[PDB]
Structure formats: structure tokens, C-alpha cells
Amino acid sequence: ARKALIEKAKRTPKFKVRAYTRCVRCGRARSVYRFFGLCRICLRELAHKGQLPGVRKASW
Amino acid sequence: ARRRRAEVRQLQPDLVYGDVLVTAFINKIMRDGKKNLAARIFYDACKIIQEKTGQEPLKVFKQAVENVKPRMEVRSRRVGGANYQVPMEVSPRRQQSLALRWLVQAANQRPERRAAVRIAHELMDAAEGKGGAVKKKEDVERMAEANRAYAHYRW
Amino acid sequence: TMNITSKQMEITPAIRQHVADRLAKLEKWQTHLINPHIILSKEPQGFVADATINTPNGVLVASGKHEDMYTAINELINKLERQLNKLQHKGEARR
Amino acid sequence: RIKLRGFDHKTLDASAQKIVEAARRSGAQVSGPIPLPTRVRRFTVIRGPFKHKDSREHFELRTHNRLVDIINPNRKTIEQLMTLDLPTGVEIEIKT
Amino acid sequence: EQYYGTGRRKEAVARVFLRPGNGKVTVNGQDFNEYFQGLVRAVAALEPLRAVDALGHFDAYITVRGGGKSGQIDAIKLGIARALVQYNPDYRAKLKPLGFLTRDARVVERKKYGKHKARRAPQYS
Amino acid sequence: GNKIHPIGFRLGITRDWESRWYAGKKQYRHLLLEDQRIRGLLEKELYSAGLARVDIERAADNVAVTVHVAKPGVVIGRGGERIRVLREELAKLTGKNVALNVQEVQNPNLSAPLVAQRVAEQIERRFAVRRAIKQAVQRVMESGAKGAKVIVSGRIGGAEQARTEWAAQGRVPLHTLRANIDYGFALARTTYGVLGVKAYIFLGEV
Amino acid sequence: SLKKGVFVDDHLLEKVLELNAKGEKRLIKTWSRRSTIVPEMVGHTIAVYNGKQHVPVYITENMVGHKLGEFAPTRTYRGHG
Amino acid sequence: GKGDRRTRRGKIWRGTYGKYRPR
RNA sequence: CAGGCCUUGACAUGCUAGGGAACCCGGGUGAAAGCCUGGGGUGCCCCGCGAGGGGAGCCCUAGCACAGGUGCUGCAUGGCCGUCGUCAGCUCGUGCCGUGAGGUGUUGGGUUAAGUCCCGCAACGAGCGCAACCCCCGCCGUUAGUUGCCAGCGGUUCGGCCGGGCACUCUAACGGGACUGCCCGCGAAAGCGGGAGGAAGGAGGGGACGACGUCUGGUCAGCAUGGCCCUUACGGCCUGGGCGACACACGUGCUACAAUGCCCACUACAAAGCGAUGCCACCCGGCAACGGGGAGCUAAUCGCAAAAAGGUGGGCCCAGUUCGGAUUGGGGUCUGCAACCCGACCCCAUGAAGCCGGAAUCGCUAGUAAUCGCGGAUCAGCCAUGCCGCGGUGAAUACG
Numbered sequence A: 001a002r003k004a005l006i007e008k009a010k011r012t013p014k015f016k017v018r019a020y021t022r023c024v025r026c027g028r029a030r031s032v033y034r035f036f037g038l039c040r041i042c043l044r045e046l047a048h049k050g051q052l053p054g055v056r057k058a059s060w
Numbered sequence B: 001a002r003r004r005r006a007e008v009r010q011l012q013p014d015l016v017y018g019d020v021l022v023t024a025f026i027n028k029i030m031r032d033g034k035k036n037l038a039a040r041i042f043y044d045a046c047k048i049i050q051e052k053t054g055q056e057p058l059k060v061f062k063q064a065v066e067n068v069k070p071r072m073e074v075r076s077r078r079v080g081g082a083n084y085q086v087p088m089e090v091s092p093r094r095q096q097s098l099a100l101r102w103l104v105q106a107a108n109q110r111p112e113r114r115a116a117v118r119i120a121h122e123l124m125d126a127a128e129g130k131g132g133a134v135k136k137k138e139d140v141e142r143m144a145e146a147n148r149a150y151a152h153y154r155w
Numbered sequence C: 001t002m003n004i005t006s007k008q009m010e011i012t013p014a015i016r017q018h019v020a021d022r023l024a025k026l027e028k029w030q031t032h033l034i035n036p037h038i039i040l041s042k043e044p045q046g047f048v049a050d051a052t053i054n055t056p057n058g059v060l061v062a063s064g065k066h067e068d069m070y071t072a073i074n075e076l077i078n079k080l081e082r083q084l085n086k087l088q089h090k091g092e093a094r095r
Numbered sequence D: 001r002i003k004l005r006g007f008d009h010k011t012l013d014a015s016a017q018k019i020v021e022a023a024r025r026s027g028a029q030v031s032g033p034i035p036l037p038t039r040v041r042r043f044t045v046i047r048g049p050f051k052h053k054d055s056r057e058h059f060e061l062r063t064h065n066r067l068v069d070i071i072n073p074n075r076k077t078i079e080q081l082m083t084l085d086l087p088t089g090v091e092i093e094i095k096t
Numbered sequence E: 001e002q003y004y005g006t007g008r009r010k011e012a013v014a015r016v017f018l019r020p021g022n023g024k025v026t027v028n029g030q031d032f033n034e035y036f037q038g039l040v041r042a043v044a045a046l047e048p049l050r051a052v053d054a055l056g057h058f059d060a061y062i063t064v065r066g067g068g069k070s071g072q073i074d075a076i077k078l079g080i081a082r083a084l085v086q087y088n089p090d091y092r093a094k095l096k097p098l099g100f101l102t103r104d105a106r107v108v109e110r111k112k113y114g115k116h117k118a119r120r121a122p123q124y125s
Numbered sequence F: 001g002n003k004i005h006p007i008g009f010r011l012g013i014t015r016d017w018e019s020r021w022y023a024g025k026k027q028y029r030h031l032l033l034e035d036q037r038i039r040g041l042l043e044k045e046l047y048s049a050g051l052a053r054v055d056i057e058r059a060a061d062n063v064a065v066t067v068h069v070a071k072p073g074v075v076i077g078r079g080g081e082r083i084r085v086l087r088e089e090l091a092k093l094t095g096k097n098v099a100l101n102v103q104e105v106q107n108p109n110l111s112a113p114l115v116a117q118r119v120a121e122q123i124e125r126r127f128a129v130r131r132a133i134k135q136a137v138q139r140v141m142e143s144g145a146k147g148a149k150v151i152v153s154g155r156i157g158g159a160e161q162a163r164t165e166w167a168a169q170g171r172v173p174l175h176t177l178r179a180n181i182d183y184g185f186a187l188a189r190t191t192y193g194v195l196g197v198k199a200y201i202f203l204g205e206v
Numbered sequence G: 001s002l003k004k005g006v007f008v009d010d011h012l013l014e015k016v017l018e019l020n021a022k023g024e025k026r027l028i029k030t031w032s033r034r035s036t037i038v039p040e041m042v043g044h045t046i047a048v049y050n051g052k053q054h055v056p057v058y059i060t061e062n063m064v065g066h067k068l069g070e071f072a073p074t075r076t077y078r079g080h081g
Numbered sequence H: 001g002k003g004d005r006r007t008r009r010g011k012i013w014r015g016t017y018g019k020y021r022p023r
Numbered sequence I: 001c002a003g004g005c006c007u008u009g010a011c012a013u014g015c016u017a018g019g020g021a022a023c024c025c026g027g028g029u030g031a032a033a034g035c036c037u038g039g040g041g042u043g044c045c046c047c048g049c050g051a052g053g054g055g056a057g058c059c060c061u062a063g064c065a066c067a068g069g070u071g072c073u074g075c076a077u078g079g080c081c082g083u084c085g086u087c088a089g090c091u092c093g094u095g096c097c098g099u100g101a102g103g104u105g106u107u108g109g110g111u112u113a114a115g116u117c118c119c120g121c122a123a124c125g126a127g128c129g130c131a132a133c134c135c136c137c138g139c140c141g142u143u144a145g146u147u148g149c150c151a152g153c154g155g156u157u158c159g160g161c162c163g164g165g166c167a168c169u170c171u172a173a174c175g176g177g178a179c180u181g182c183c184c185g186c187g188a189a190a191g192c193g194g195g196a197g198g199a200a201g202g203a204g205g206g207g208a209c210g211a212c213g214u215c216u217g218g219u220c221a222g223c224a225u226g227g228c229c230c231u232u233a234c235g236g237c238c239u240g241g242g243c244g245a246c247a248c249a250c251g252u253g254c255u256a257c258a259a260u261g262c263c264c265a266c267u268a269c270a271a272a273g274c275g276a277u278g279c280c281a282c283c284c285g286g287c288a289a290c291g292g293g294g295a296g297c298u299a300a301u302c303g304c305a306a307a308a309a310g311g312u313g314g315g316c317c318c319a320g321u322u323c324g325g326a327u328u329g330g331g332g333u334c335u336g337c338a339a340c341c342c343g344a345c346c347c348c349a350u351g352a353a354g355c356c357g358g359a360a361u362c363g364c365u366a367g368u369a370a371u372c373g374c375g376g377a378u379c380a381g382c383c384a385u386g387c388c389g390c391g392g393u394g395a396a397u398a399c400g
């Protein structure tokens, strides 16, 4: 049970409870961000790459 | 303190008697940062220090502190196969710190229900030479003395 | 008390009490063995036995490694014994 | 009032001076760029792909707002501002 | 008519008006005594006035916002201190070495990840 | 197993973003998810071009989609034909106004992504890896830089035991906030497995 | 818990108000542990799923507000030692 | 106290309102 | 895990033998999945007045070629991370020394947070690390004002509310300021002590950053990837169970054993954030959770909001208690298709252990520990006492 999984989260099934964020890049269910569409890993890779608009290493 | 000497902070004098020794004391009464609390106790006690035994609560306080500060104490070194309790004089720094500490500590073991009373009474007795604190002093001091002959292993 | 972790392996009540029995050797020194923990583990070369134990005079840590699991465990105790005799006798150089 | 949004504050404040000081000539009385408190979105993320929960780097997202007021509009300030030098992203607002 | 200084300690700002008079003081629309009742640190940030031997010389209108009562006091401290030194700036001498101006920069430290309270670390084996 | 990404570490300082725009909550995800489809479409198709970096812009239904490159030819083409076949397919997914763009890169051997994917394809090509690495640095320093560093890791020359190969000339001070360090990464899938390549180019102080 | 509505699946609901109508039988197999025991069920044998088995429960007016699952428990315990 | 639902301080910790810490 | 189902597949590209396409709705059945099934009818390049027609959007069936596999190996791997360790280190070039491994430099004296810097020196340089360049805080300047203001007057329905103003406070962008630069003292120098001015001095405090390498460290279950393995099954859909089981053992934490405390009622002072099928003012029903209505806000202009400890004054009177709130009985609310297993909250009743903890053991040097509340991610709800942040009050001690 893996790639079939990412497909199963696409078309929205019987009840709306069954809604769960997966992520676009990796099929990761765990630690997906709503704002990015991303997991915490994928998020990191992209941010560091400079591909996330106005996203910067924080530091205060 | 490997490196240099460790600064001794000075302290804001208090807004009643204008004397550093009181705040240190109030600091030692304090618990979980609640300083306002730590204040009223000392002062309330000061009400009581005048109320009963009409006098100068400042005087009483500052007296029972000198009646507590230990002149000589043991600090134990390992030499060979035994740990010797060793006689050494306490710095004025350490005496203050040991003064205030035992005072409070012995205060809070009194049977009086209200904290400031406990503080009131313990101080009144220490002024006179009676109490848990004073004991601890005399005690520490007889434990020095009797070790007089370990005064050579002294740093 | 004593805990044993068989990591990525199917262990048994019998061999568990065997390791409890081999560790008993350190009871010889008559010194408190505090929450001892052994970990048994496979490996392509051979087994691995680790243990980490604290005692009033310090802590013991060591790894046994070997083809036979039992000789790995023995090796582990052999290494532990040494460490324990050292914590026990070290400052006796008290001259 | 014309509200300015967007992430890079250097890009933005360039085009808060453009728009405001544009309509200074072509209009009046141009109430200067007023910085709004910036809305920060923090993301704290676990550095590694695996366990290691005590190692993390913080990532934030800085979205800052500016309001600019032009006192008397002077229509054709509604033309000289009906285009302008952008830059590549920023949010323009206009209302009365 | 007036004398100004700006006090701050720890996310708190005091605006102090040194306007001359009886010595009545108002903080956020009520006398010192009503706004700080209880707290003994309240006796006070008025200490800067007793510093230059004027006690009653001035009244004070004071707004204060940010932080909490004590923080607010220490702000009033560099307030009545900054205001009074402005009034007759032969006033730095005996206010300054008495450590009255010079706002303390001591603030809360960021909580750091992996620690609990920004220094207190969690327990281990 | 320690080092911070030298691009991510300078975002806003030496270096700047390759997708530049503004959004806000309701549509960010989507905007963004577009870019990364665009990026995939491009990086696949535009592979043997060269390049390094794709800057991207947005206003409304307007994608500027800039592409810097090694040899612009495989984009523009004969008379500028294929530039348009792409300007199409982008738009087909973009569902909005695409602008396909080509900027040429100056000394493709001064660019990090570009130098690293060359040594990369050279490794898939079965070359002495240690020598491939000295060279790829040699080329950079010859065409100028203030220093250069290059890293391969994996079954280098096919060795059972993994190994990691390292070479550098001149400065590469990754602790300095104004480095201008161009860093780029490629990947060599060989008959035996994957090897990572990292290049570092020190262009100079800002 | 569960404020206004009375929850029975309207799958075994149907089944019970039919069997009661004509000549009432037994052996209704269900996997719904979520179903309340509704007074129309009172007396029957329903076969309820705990997940490896369909466990039969005689219904009695002793138990109504409950759920059909409560009487076919999911864990086989027996003890320790 | 902080664990006792029936008290003010109880509800505060628990982050709720009721008879004992009303709105 | 148990049972019920699917095969060219839930999914990619491509080729074909039938039919068709697209699409929306029931049915019969079943727990559902699935199986079995009654409908309407395809624009289009189009011989067309016609039957009809060709194509290909797109569906199916049959057939493959294949897909798919969170199956194995982190000692075959990339990538990213933990760690020694913010420790002061690790090396290269040429030269010199040794048959050689290798030495030298890098050691030595002195000083620093530091291979920091000074002075020596068969060495002379160079690089990766230190520092600095970046962010936050502390002081001042500018630019700027639908946030702030009787500071100023006027009005003032008394709400900075209107007028009016940017002085304030602030907000958020750009600057300045700290340099051992100045005095004394010592030194050969680097630099140490002491002083002045300064909001701040000796790295002003906190952050981001973490060398060559180590642990055959960690992850094939985020992703990727070599190789091995399964192909009506190690693939795929579903209903249900499980991941919450409980003789036991450890680790992290919550709340406590009370009077420096507990309870009630009135009354203060933050910061950072977050809000459109969201944040809900306010009105009403309800003891309440909540439920009705219902205004504002794409939000410095509305809302979450109450901050809490504190302040006041009243009760409790040393009691396993007006300490502590576990456990259980019963009655309700809300989310959700559904709260048996298994949600959170509210109310009534129940008020367990616990009187400060063995061997052993953890954290913290100052706005720190302790203590007090607040926000956020993830999220229908929530088992958060967790985590990441934020301010409030605010200690003790460092001989060595």
C-alpha cells in the first residue's frame, strides 16, 4: 500500500471526514502543511533551493 | 569559576529602611519570584517586632544577623584514605549568606501558623541568642574548634 | 529491575533468563546494580550484546560481538566485570 | 488610499516611492508611505528526514503592508498612475 | 510649562510630564497610589525626583503602557530621570553616577528549540 | 552530515529567489504547484541545453518563466520555432499567458549547476572520477574564480564499499555571508547505483 | 454523548422491522457495532462482528440504549501468567 | 487545584468556562 | 489482523481485435466494495437536402508490453540529519631533516572566547575551520503617517468621541553609535587592570552559522536509487477489528501532598500571533457545556481577549482538611456518516493515592533558574500534561 495511496487521497470519497492532506511531491501524509501543500521535508528542500516565494531562514 | 573570579552582585537597597541587607533577606524569603509577597512578610514581621518588644525592627534584624554569622566552619578534604572535616574561617560574604539562609530556614520550621510571625519571632530570639538558626551557628562552630588540629591541611 | 531488549530478533523467555543468569556474575562484588539494560542484536558478522548499567560508584558500558550469541554475551560480561572491578578498586592508590 | 503588499520590502518600498511620489506631480497632496505592522508566518521544521526532534531550523515569511493616501485625486493622476513601473511582484490597492 | 523624558524597561514605555507643582502624580488617569497599590517597588521610580533634592517641585502627568506593573515602574524611572535632567542639564551630575538614566537592556531571552524554557534542558540518562 | 545549504543560507543576501512573486493564503499552494510542474516540464525537455536556473514571475494569468542557459539554440531553434512549441505546452498547463524566455549564461564553466552536471554525465560515462574532479575544478579556476570545490560520493568507479571524493583550488569560505558562492547539484545513475555531485564556485565578495 | 437523533444504520434497521412483520426469525449477520439496540430488536439473536468473528447476542430489554458492539468484545484476554 | 475541574484555576488550566469560571 | 470482493488494475506510456465514445440518474443486490443492470445521446475535418459516412476528442471489453509492492539489504547507495563540538582544531604548497614511516610549519615564550594576536624560530606562505560580513534586542537621527494624542485649544453625548495636530507612543524601512579610539598603570609587543564620557564598553545580550573527519552512527517507511524478491498476489478496493490489549519493568512529563496555601467576589498591567463555507461583537434560552438569533472584519482601522500570578476584603484554621482531584455512578452538550471498542467539554454525586519521597539522579550563572498565563502549527473533533514561540513577576550562589 503506497502509490495507490497517493491516488486515493485525490478523488474525494464517501464522507468528508475522510479528507486528509497528503503532499504533492512525496506522498507523505505526516506533517503536511496546508499553506504550502508540502511536508516538512519537501518544504525544507524547496525553501533552501530558493523556489519558495519570499521564504527565508528566520533568525531572531 | 575556572576562569577568573565570579562577580558578587550588589543589590538595590530597600524602599523602607534603605539597606541592602534587608532586600537580600527579602530575597531569601522569596519563593517563585513573588517578591511583593516576600516584602510584606518581612515588614509585617517588622510590625510584630515593634508591637511585641517595642524596639527598632531594623536594630533587631541587624542584631540577629550578627548573632548568626558563623566565624569558623568545616570544609572537608580527602587526604590519603580518610575524609577530614577541616577548620576554616568563613568569608564575610559567606557569613551573610549563611546568616540569612539559616534564619529563614529555621524560621519556616517554627510552629507559628502565619509566615511573618515565624519571621518575627525567629529574629527576636536570635537577637537574644535563642533559636534554630543560632544553634546551627554554635553547632557549626563546635564542629570547627574540635577539629583544631586539622587546621594545618588548610588552604 | 533488569530489562532486556531483543532488537530485530525473536528472543525467548529461556534465553532471557540465561542473560539474567550470566549478568548475575556481577553480584559477586556486592554493589548495587541499578536498572541494568542489555540489548541483543543480530548483525551479518555475528551477534551483538550491549549493556549499560549504573552503580553507586559509577556506570558500566560495554559491547560484546561474536558469531555465537552465547559467546557474545559471555564476552559482554567479561568486559563488564573488568569495568566493575576498576570502579571498585580504583582509588585504593591512597598510599 | 492605495495599499501595498508583497514580500521583498526592498521591491515594495521602491514602488511605494514610485506610486506616492508619482502622484505628487500630477496631483497633490500625497500623504506619505505609511508602513503597516508586518504579518509574519513562521514555519518550524525538524531538520532531518528521521527522528532527531531536538534539531530544527525556523523559516519565516514576511508579508508587509504599506498604505499611501493622495489628498486631492486630480484625475489624470488616475492616468499617469493607470500604468506604472511594477516590479515583478507586489500587491496594489486603490479605493477612495 | 512642561518637562519630558521617555522611559522604557522590558517591553514597556513611560511618557513622563514633569509639569511643576505640589508633587501629585498621575499614571494613566489616577494617582500613583491608586495605580500601584500594594507593590513595594512602587516607592518608587519616583526615586529620580528625590535624587535631585527636589521632592515637591513638580507634579507629574504620566501615561504608561506595555509590560506589567514593575516594568512600568522602571520606565517611569528613566522617565522622571530623563525629564528632570532635561529641565536643568547640570542635572546629569549626581543623577548619572547614581545610575538613574541609562535604561537597562535586560530582557527576556528567546525560547530555543530542544531546550524547554530557553536554558532549562530536558532530563536524560 | 552537518553543513547548511550555501544557497538557502544566502537567500536575501548574496543570492535571490528563482520564483519571485506575492500571493497570500487562499492561492499560494496552487500558484506554487504550477511552478513545480513548469519546472519538471522544462528541466526534463530543456536538459540538453545546458542551463542552471529558471527565474519565474507572476501578476495575474501572467507567467514570465525566464530561462538562463548554456546554449540557447535548443530552445529558440531554427528562426525561433521550438521557443514557441514550448511557449505553447507551458500555456496548455499554465492555462494562462505564458512567456517562454531565454537568457544566455556567460562562461557556462562559471556556473555551479552547469559544471557539476558535466562531471555528473562524465561519471555515468565511466570516467576516472578522481581525474574528472580535478579537471572540472581546473576548468573553473582557469576561466577565473576566487576559488573552486567539487564533491562526488558513492560507489566511485563502482567500488562495493562506498567512498567520497573531494577536490578544491583557491578559496571557498562557506561561513562568509557575502560569498557569492554558486553551488549546484547533479546526479549520476550508473549501472550500479547513484552518485552525488556538488560544485561550489566562489565568485567574490559583495 | 450523541444529542438529538437516534443512530441505527438504516441497514440493520430495515432488517429488524421486516423480520418482526412476517413471522419473526433469527440469525441476522451484521458488521455494525455502531448500531443502538432499539426496542424493536428486543429479543432476537444478531451476529455481531468483533473483526475475526460474528459473535451472537440474544437481545433482552435489560439492554437498549447500548451499542451492538459492546456485547461482542474485540479483545481475547484470559490473563497474564 | 489546577487539576480540579470544579474550580476557577481548574478551568483556566483546562481552558474552558462553566459555572465555576463563567464568561 | 478477520472476512467480502477486483486484474490489467486505484495509477504511466504505447500498440492493437469488437463496440463505442463523452456524459447525468435509478434500479436489483450487498455491511460496503463489488456484482448484476433501465436510461438520454457527442460537437466535429466532414460526399451531406438523404440512409449513411470517415476521423478523433473520451468510455469499455478483449488482448498484451506492462503496472504496482511502506516486500529485503542504511555494511551496495544519493540526499538530509544526530554526534564528538562552538571544542581549536585539520591540512596543503615549495623548502629543509630522516634510508624510511614520517618530522618541520602547527613547536617554543606571552595573550586571547579562539592555530586570536604578539615576539621567537629552517622555514616561507597558503587553504578549510576562529572572527567579521546577515537577523533580533538595547540608545539617537531621518522618512512616514485613518495606529497614538486636552502634549495644545475648542467642542466633548464623555468613547481620543468630533475638530485639529505628528509633539508623543508606535509602527517599519534607511542611517548613526563601540574602535581598546581617550586618560592613568604594566609591557618588548600583542594585550591585561583601572578611569572618563556613553543608552551600551572590552565578543553590549540572544540568534543564524558548526572544519578535515568519527561513530561500517541514523533513515530503502518522506523521496530518490543499484541489487535480490512477489505478479487472480508480498499488487488493488472495502466493512470491521487492531495500532489504546495489562501480571509486570524503565524513560520523559502533568497535578499534588498545602497557610509564602486553598476558595469566593470585585479590580488592574503584556507580548507575539491567528482569523470568509473563519475569527463571532452584542441580545436571548440554558446552573452550564452549548443553542438560538445577529453586527463588524479580505483585518494596526472589526474578532479570538480573559491574560495569569498580582491588587483589594472576605471565608477556611492544621484537619488527610474548604489540602489533592484519581476512580466510579447518573444526567447533558458539540464534532462527525458514525464517539461499543476509542473523542473532547459541561453538571450532579463519588472524593483514591499522596504528610515532600531508597539506592541513585537531572537542569540552570541573570532577566537565568523558579513561578504565571497567552498564542501557533498539525487540525472536523481530539486523547496537547507534547512541541515551537510569547510576554508577566523575578531570586540564589561561584573559595576554588
Ligand SMILES: [Mg+2]
Pocket (backbone or CB within 6 Å): A017, A019, A020
Ligand atoms: Mg482527519
Ligand SMILES: [Mg+2]
Pocket (backbone or CB within 6 Å): E108
Ligand atoms: Mg519567560
Ligand SMILES: [Mg+2]
Pocket (backbone or CB within 6 Å): A060, E110, E111, E112, E113
Ligand atoms: Mg530562538
Ligand SMILES: [Mg+2]
Pocket (backbone or CB within 6 Å): D053, D054, E122
Ligand atoms: Mg524533547
Ligand SMILES: [Mg+2]
Pocket (backbone or CB within 6 Å): E124
Ligand atoms: Mg535523548
Ligand SMILES: [Mg+2]
Pocket (backbone or CB within 6 Å): H001, H004
Ligand atoms: Mg479542591
Ligand SMILES: [Mg+2]
Pocket (backbone or CB within 6 Å): H002
Ligand atoms: Mg500551582
Ligand SMILES: [Mg+2]
Pocket (backbone or CB within 6 Å): none
Ligand atoms: Mg437494499
Ligand SMILES: [Mg+2]
Pocket (backbone or CB within 6 Å): I074
Ligand atoms: Mg550508514
Ligand SMILES: [Mg+2]
Pocket (backbone or CB within 6 Å): none
Ligand atoms: Mg547515508
Ligand SMILES: [Mg+2]
Pocket (backbone or CB within 6 Å): none
Ligand atoms: Mg538499523
Ligand SMILES: [Mg+2]
Pocket (backbone or CB within 6 Å): none
Ligand atoms: Mg630525502
Ligand SMILES: [Mg+2]
Pocket (backbone or CB within 6 Å): none
Ligand atoms: Mg610531510
Ligand SMILES: [Mg+2]
Pocket (backbone or CB within 6 Å): I106
Ligand atoms: Mg596538530
Ligand SMILES: [Mg+2]
Pocket (backbone or CB within 6 Å): I086, I113, I114
Ligand atoms: Mg571558541
Ligand SMILES: [Mg+2]
Pocket (backbone or CB within 6 Å): I115
Ligand atoms: Mg588564523
